[PDB]
């Protein structure tokens, strides 16, 4: 039948989430921030980032458990924020996941020239050969990995899920071994590598927040878990538990790595006594570097496998509602999985990784997921207070205006606090007025109690965010600040992409679409 198979399980959701998260996590830990902050400071930065990601994941889990559907943030934005804003959230999410997978593949390929360790096998006709254009600089590269991953995903949800589970379990086991070795070495040397003169957290909460600002994008895997909601047997129970256990395991792993391996990588490289060599002889860091590269590559491969399984679901939801041609809607009669939409997304990601460099792909990815988070936060706020269905008769309108005011005030004060180019004299006025209207709206929102019709939306029961009046607003503030912080380089590209999206929508999607035709 034309129905997705509910063959996935809670353990399989945890595996998907942890793999997708750990890939980006290791990508960041290999980056500049790792050596920017001290070990313990990096760990607490990951802790705060995990707290914020949990603020977002609570809304995700609530909306997924109550009304499970493959549309993910698209489906949610379409119900609360309404149509149109959804097509912009879903389109941005598609671009984000696609460019994440493409960047991961483009980064993996050069390091994967051999089995591990960065060695080169010297292939022929598959190596990177710059296009000899008169004034063209493109450097095409082997993007077959995307084709293999797309074939895997097209082969079913259990088969691809099982392969992802195998890869991510191997990754987690090697990471656990890598942490145990690091801890054993540290205890053998007595943690002498952490005799930091400036002490831990040398820059105060100011740094811990600055570090957590860039370390926040390491927890971007729960949205994919939501995207695969339709495959779960009883999503109401598994999805929230799976997402929670995935953000918990990822946070613990990140803190452990940051305190044992990353915060000491300088120690093992600089100290003349060379404890690694003294503990393992002549081989020394050579085997340690091989093991670290193995762990990083396994994590990146797991996340590459995980990423491209969301976009087909988003496209399926879009086509099912009607904003995309039915070409994306139909599923395989045999594999019970998007095969045409998955193939289209796979060929798109393959082309994007083939042409664009990793340094260029990384400059466009970040914005979509933040918008999805903000949208889902506004969605919990609107579905738990003013659900769009069915003491005061004006309670609905006042609550709606209060939510609009909190949405405006967060923007106002997050752009005031993140805009140092503005003179202080009007900056103070704008931040103060935005803050006071936000506080007043929050007071009004709390004064008006939760609508009891919230017992009706989706299915009864399920998970509900802990602090509905304050937690969603905190998530909105965090995500809006992160969005505004992002530089114009990524904003111009996402703007042109969203413009393309709006073009497609106005030319086809508004004229032909269910609930509007």
Partner 1 sequence: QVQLVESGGGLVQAGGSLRLSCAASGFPVNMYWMHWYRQAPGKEREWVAAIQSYGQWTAYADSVKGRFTISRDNAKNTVYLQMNSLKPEDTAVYYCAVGVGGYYLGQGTQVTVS
Ligand X SMILES: CCCCCCCCCCC(CCCCCCCCCC)(CO[C@@H]1O[C@H](CO)[C@@H](O[C@H]2O[C@H](CO)[C@@H](O)[C@H](O)[C@H]2O)[C@H](O)[C@H]1O)CO[C@@H]1O[C@H](CO)[C@@H](O[C@H]2O[C@H](CO)[C@@H](O)[C@H](O)[C@H]2O)[C@H](O)[C@H]1O
Ligand Y SMILES: CC(C)CCC[C@@H](C)[C@H]1CC[C@H]2[C@@H]3CC=C4C[C@@H](O)CC[C@]4(C)[C@H]3CC[C@]12C
Least Cβ distance, residue 282 to ligand X (angstroms): 13
DSSP string over 39-91? HHHHHHHHHHHHHHHHHHHHHHHHHHHHS--TTTHHHHHHHTT-TTHHHHHHH
Taking CB under 8 A as the criterion, the residue among 1, 2, 3, 32 binding partner 1 is 32
Name which position in 47, 116, 194, 508 contacts partner 1 (CB under 8 A).
194
- Partner from ligand Y, ligand X, partner 1, none contacting 212, C-beta within 5 to 8 A by type: ligand Y
Binding mask 444-483 for ligand Y (x = CB under 6 A): -------------------------------------xx-
How close are the terminal C-alpha atoms of the chain, in Å? 27
The tokens of 213 are what? 């600002």
- From the list 56, 69, 212, 342, which residue makes contact with ligand Y (rule: CB under 6 A)? 212
Are 304 and 111 spatial neighbours (Cβ–Cβ below 8 Å)? Answer: no
Taking the complex as a whole, the smallest distance from the CB of residue 32 to partner 1 amounts, in Å, to: 4
- Residue-wise burial string across 16-49, b where 16 or more C-beta atoms lie within 10 A, e elsewhere: bbbbbbbbbbbbbbbeebbeebbbbbbbbbbbbb
- From candidates 93, 213, 318, 339, binder to ligand Y by CB under 6 A: 213
DSSP state of 450: P
Residue 307 phi, psi (nearest 5)? -60, -50
Secondary structure of 401-424 as H, E, C letters: HHHHHHHHHHHHHHHHHCCCCCCH
249 belongs to the binding site for ligand X (CB under 6 A): no
Beta carbons within 8 Å of 489's beta carbon, 6+ residues apart? 363
Stretch that binds ligand Y, among 206-214, 231-239, 323-331, 404-412 (CB under 6 A): 206-214
The residue within the footprint of ligand X, chosen from 145, 246, 255, 288 (CB under 6 A), is: 288
CA 36 to chain centre: 22
Interactions with ligand X, residue window 100-119 (CB under 6 A): 118
288 binds, among ligand Y, partner 1, ligand X, none (CB under 5 to 8 A by kind): ligand X
Question: What value does the CA radius of gyration of the chain take, rounded to a whole number of Å?
Answer: 24
Task: Tell me how many residues contact partner 1 (CB under 8 A).
Answer: 22
CA dist 384 and 164 (Å) reads 35
Sole binder of ligand Y in the list 3, 32, 206, 424 (CB under 6 A): 206
| Stretch of 8-16, 86-94, 193-201, 315-323 contacting partner 1, by CB under 8 A | 193-201
Q: Is residue 3 a contact partner of residue 336, using CB atoms and an 8 Å limit? A: yes
Are 294 and 284 contacting, i.e. CB atoms less than 8 angstroms apart? no
CA distance 103 to 304: 9
Which of 96, 104, 30 is closest to 305 using CA atoms?
104
Find the binder of partner 1 among 271, 360, 502, 513 (CB under 8 A). Answer: 271
Q: How far is the CB of 22 from ligand X (least distance, A)?
A: 9
Contact status, residue 321 vs residue 514, Cβ threshold 8 Å:
yes
Please choose which of partner 1, ligand X, ligand Y, none residue 481 contacts, taking the beta carbon within 5 to 8 angstroms, the exact cut-off set by kind.
ligand Y
Quick one: DSSP state of residue 71? T
Coil vs helix vs strand at 232? strand
**If contact means CB under 5 to 8 A according to the sort of partner, which of ligand Y, partner 1, ligand X, none does residue 448 touch?**
none
Contact region with partner 1 (CB under 8 A), list: 160-168, 188-196, 279-287, 316-324? 188-196
Residue from the set 38, 174, 224, 362 that interacts with partner 1 by CB under 8 A: 38
CB of 200 to partner 1, least distance (A): 10
CB of 482 to ligand Y, least distance (A): 6
Instruction: Specify the residue, 167 or 483, whose C-beta has the smaller distance to ligand X.
Output: 167
Q: Among 386, 383, 379, 398, which residue's Cα sits nearest to residue 476?
A: 379
Q: Which of residues 85-114 bind ligand Y (CB under 6 A)?
A: none
To which H or E segment does residue 307 belong? helix 285-307
Chain center to CA of 180: 28
Residues 15-54 that bind ligand X (CB under 6 A): 26, 29-30
Q: Using CA atoms, how far apart are residues 105 and 100, in angstroms rounded to an integer?
A: 9
Angle at which helix 235-260 crosses helix 10-29, to 10 degrees, equals 30
H-run or E-run covering 470: none
Q: Is 263 near partner 1 (CB under 8 A)?
A: yes
Helix (H, G, I), strand (E, B) or coil at 8: strand
Name which position in 107, 182, 207, 458 contacts ligand X (CB under 6 A).
Answer: 182
Q: What is the chain's length? A: 517
Stretch that binds partner 1, among 69-77, 118-126, 187-195, 315-323 (CB under 8 A): 187-195
Select from ligand Y, ligand X, partner 1, none the partner in contact with residue 194, using the beta carbon and a kind-dependent cut-off of 5 to 8 Å: partner 1
Taking CB under 8 A as the rule, does residue 36 contact partner 1?
yes
In 3D, which of 91, 77, 55 has the Cα closest to residue 383?
A: 77
Nearer to partner 1, 197 or 281 (CB): 197
Smallest distance from the beta carbon of 47 to ligand Y, in angstroms?
13
Residues forming the site for ligand Y (CB under 6 A): 203, 206, 209-210, 212-213, 481-482
Residues forming the site for partner 1 (CB under 8 A): 32-33, 35-36, 38-39, 193-198, 202-203, 207, 263, 266-267, 269-272
Residues forming the site for ligand X (CB under 6 A): 26, 29-30, 118, 178, 181-182, 257, 261-262, 265, 268-269, 276, 285, 288-289, 291-293, 295-296
């Amino acid at each position: 039948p034309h129905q997705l198979a509910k063959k996935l399980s809670a353990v399989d959701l945890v595996a998907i989430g942890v793999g997708t998260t750990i890939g980006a996590g290791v990508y960041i830990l290999v980056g500049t921030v790792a050596r920017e902050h001290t070990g313990p400071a990096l760990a607490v930065s990951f802790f705060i980032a995990g707290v914020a990601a949990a603020l977002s994941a609570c809304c995700y889990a609530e909306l997924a458990s109550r009304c499970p559907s493959a549309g993910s943030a698209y489906h949610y934005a379409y119900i609360c924020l309404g149509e149109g804003i959804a097509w912009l959230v879903g389109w941005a999410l598609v671009l984000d996941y696609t460019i994440g997978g493409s960047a991961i593949a483009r980064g993996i390929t050069p390091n994967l020239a051999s089995f591990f360790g960065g060695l080169d096998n010297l292939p022929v006709f598959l190596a990177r050969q710059t296009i000899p254009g008169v004034g063209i600089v493109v450097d095409p590269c082997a993007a077959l990995l995307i084709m293999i991953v797309t074939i895997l995903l097209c082969f079913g949800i259990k088969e691809s899920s099982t392969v992802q589970a195998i890869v991510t379990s191997v990754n987690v086991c090697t990471l656990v071994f890598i942490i145990v070795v690091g801890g054993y070495l540290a205890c053998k040397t007595g943690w002498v590598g952490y005799d930091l003169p400036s002490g831990y957290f040398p820059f105060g909460l100011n740094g811990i927040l600055a570090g957590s600002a860039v370390v926040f994008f390491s927890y971007i895997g729960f949205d994919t878990v939501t995207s695969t909601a339709e495959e779960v047997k009883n999503p109401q129970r598994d999805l929230p538990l799976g997402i929670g256990i995935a953000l918990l395991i990822c946070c613990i792993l990140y803190m452990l790595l940051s305190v044992v391996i990353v915060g000491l990588v300088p120690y093992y490289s600089l100290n003349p006594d060379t404890p690694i060599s003294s503990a393992f002889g002549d081989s020394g860091m050579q085997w340690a570097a091989y093991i670290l590269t193995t762990g990083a590559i396994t994590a990146l491969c797991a996340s590459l496998l995980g990423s491209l399984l969301a976009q087909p679901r988003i496209f399926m939801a879009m086509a099912r509602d009607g904003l995309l041609p039915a070409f994306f809607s139909e599923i395989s009669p045999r594999t019970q999985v998007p095969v045409k939409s998955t193939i289209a997304i796979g060929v798109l990601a393959a082309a994007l990784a083939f042409f664009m460099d990793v340094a260029q792909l990384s400059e466009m990815v970040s914005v979509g997921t933040l918008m999805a988070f903000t949208a889902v936060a506004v969605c919990v706020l609107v579905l738990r207070y003013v659900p769009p269905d069915g003491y005061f008769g004006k309670r609905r309108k006042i609550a709606a205006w209060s939510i609009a005011l909190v949405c405006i005030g967060v923007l106002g004060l997050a752009s005031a606090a993140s805009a140092e180019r503005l003179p202080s004299f009007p900056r103070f006025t704008i931040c103060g007025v935005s803050a006071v209207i936000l506080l007043g709206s929050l007071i009004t929102l709390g004064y008006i109690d939760e609508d009891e019709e919230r017992h009706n939306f989706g299915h009864k029961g399920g998970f509900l965010c802990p602090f509905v009046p304050y937690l969603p607003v905190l998530c909105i503030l965090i995500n809006t600040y992160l969005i505004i912080n992002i530089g114009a380089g990524t904003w111009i590209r996402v703007l042109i992409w969203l413009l393309i999206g709006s073009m497609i929508y106005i030319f086809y999607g508004r004229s032909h679409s269910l609930l509007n035709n």
